[PDB]
Design a protein around this ligand. Structure first.
Ligand SMILES: COc1ccccc1OCCNC(=O)c1cc(=O)[nH]c2cccc(OC)c12
Ligand SMILES: COc1ccccc1OCCNC(=O)c1cc(=O)[nH]c2cccc(OC)c12
Lengths: 304, 304
């Protein structure tokens, strides 16, 4: 028993982190096979960030201007190309620690682990979720760009995020491993504001199932509701609308606990309408929305 | 900016996890040099757990009864000995992935990362704290015993915890790497209850400094207090008494923010007396006590 914000083991990803320097800027890169992936803003000076023309900036760069270091050994760059907002630095050596991998673009509401890095060295690992407004609430300082987000399926690392920037609001923006930003964000130091940060309803419900499985049942009530009635309440509290697909995905948690999805929805409805009254659920005083139904099942079953 | 419950990268520890089987029981072991460390309750049947005599149980065991597997390869056991509540299985091969390590016994209030494992395979990593009642609020299922707690100092892994059991209350008990339990717990399936779980005051204050550093300042007030006045309030809310050593340790956070430790104590006092009024601090609706002053400085400075 017990329920923690758990990240995937980071070893397979640690073996891919490298340092990429271009001019005076040093950030992180991801070394997979004979390619190093990094944010293209590595080629910018802090002055350039206000309005950079990356194609023009890239013309002044050659293979030898990109310094790639894995541990204390320098990698030889034999090619460079821009794919959307990432640079792909072709190196002459394939990473001997390359795990089985995939590049996946995630949907809002999905979760992933972040291995925060500075100067190509891992400093920590934590669990995140892609917010419905396509930001992530990470923990990143200067030098963290190029840190990646990932999921692990047994021995296969699915890379889903690469860190690019912090918005003036302190939230984080980035791309998938093909260089496309999540959301409307651009790699420019400009007025960019995130939209409404709505609560991931399907994740909150999954976390209520985890609480029931772990013994916290005070919030269970004698009521039920309908998808339409529940969503009237969800909209008022800036919660994502619950769909029949979400009910279906919550199916195995409903089967495990014997509590119907709509019954759990009515408990959530009352928690939204009346608050927690000074009580806690899984050691938290608010409704947690950064555990998907898959994370709850995985944590409550022991998937290694 | 941003503040997350961050665990250390787990790679160095993943390379030490092995599976140890004795009879029908399989748990995790820690392979360092030519020794595999595991809970001694590996030699027990579920019947034995009610009142095991480990010396008598160990007499019936030989080197060949302890099956040690690292990945898909079997390790040859050439020795076995009991040190307090851990077994030390001498293997004929030194772990080639052994990192620089130390065995340290931690104080209550200190934090560490846990790499939860099942069948010698890592499933997840999370951050924990040794509670003042010597329990940890982990996330562990059947098969997780032998999972370890650790801290990392650059390239040196300081092992501090080995998981042994879950108390009837759902909290977790375990030992240091020399086999001595944290707290009064014994490796017996018996009526064992944890004492009062007090709040680690020095950690809450450090997390209030992290909140100020990250922009959350609503709780800052026009008041100050004294160590004695603060502790009168701390005792009433089952908070650990704040000492001059704690004030000293909070020194660099006080210097960084310009907020005196006693001023932060008065803000905490008002938060205890009046609650958060529906507001949040670092995305939390309660006072977080599982970040030491060192964790806050590390996370807010970028220690890799
Ligand atoms: C506005 O900056 C950019 C705009 C578009 C594209 C890139 C931009 O930044 C590049 C450098 N960013 C970081 O290293 C940075 C990332 C982060 O998540 N947190 C920080 C916290 C404090 C200071 C920081 O940088 C000085 C960071
Ligand atoms: C009362 O048991 C013991 C007493 C003393 C010493 C050892 C005891 O347990 C040995 C086996 N323990 C685990 O594998 C176990 C550990 C854990 O933290 N959570 C669980 C959650 C559900 C089921 C579980 O085991 C069947 C566990």
């Amino acid at each position: 028993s017990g329920f923690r914000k758990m990240a995937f083991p980071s070893g397979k990803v640690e073996g891919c982190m490298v340092q990429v320097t271009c001019g005076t800027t040093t950030l992180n890169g991801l070394w997979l096979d004979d390619v190093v992936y990094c944010p293209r803003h590595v080629i910018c000076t802090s002055e350039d960030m206000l309005n950079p023309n990356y194609e023009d900036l890239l013309i002044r760069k050659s293979n030898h201007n990109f310094l790639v270091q894995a541990g204390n050994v320098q990698l030889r760059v034999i090619g460079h190309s821009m794919q959307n907002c990432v640079l792909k630095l072709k190196v002459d050596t394939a990473n001997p620690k390359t795990p089985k991998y995939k590049f996946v673009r995630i949907q809002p509401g999905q979760t992933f682990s972040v291995l925060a890095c500075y100067n190509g060295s891992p400093s920590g690992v934590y669990q995140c979720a892609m917010r419905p407004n396509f930001t992530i609430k990470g923990s990143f300082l200067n030098g963290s760009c190029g840190s990646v987000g990932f999921n692990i399926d047994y021995d296969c690392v699915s890379f889903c995020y690469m860190h690019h920037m912090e918005l003036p609001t302190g939230v984080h923006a980035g791309t998938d491993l093909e260089g496309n930003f999540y959301g409307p964000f651009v790699d420019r130091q400009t007025a960019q504001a995130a939209g409404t940060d709505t609560t991931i309803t399907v994740n909150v419900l999954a976390w209520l199932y985890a609480a029931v499985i772990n013994g916290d049942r005070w919030f269970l009530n004698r009521f039920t509701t309908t998808l339409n009635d529940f969503n009237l309440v969800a909209m008022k509290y800036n919660y994502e609308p619950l769909t029949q697909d979400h009910v279906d995905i919550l199916g195995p948690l409903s089967a495990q606990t014997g509590i119907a999805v709509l019954d759990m929805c009515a408990s959530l409805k009352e928690l939204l309408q009346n608050g927690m009254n000074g009580r806690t659920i899984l050691g938290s005083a608010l409704l947690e929305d950064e555990f998907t139904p898959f994370d709850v099942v995985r944590q409550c079953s022991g998937v290694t």
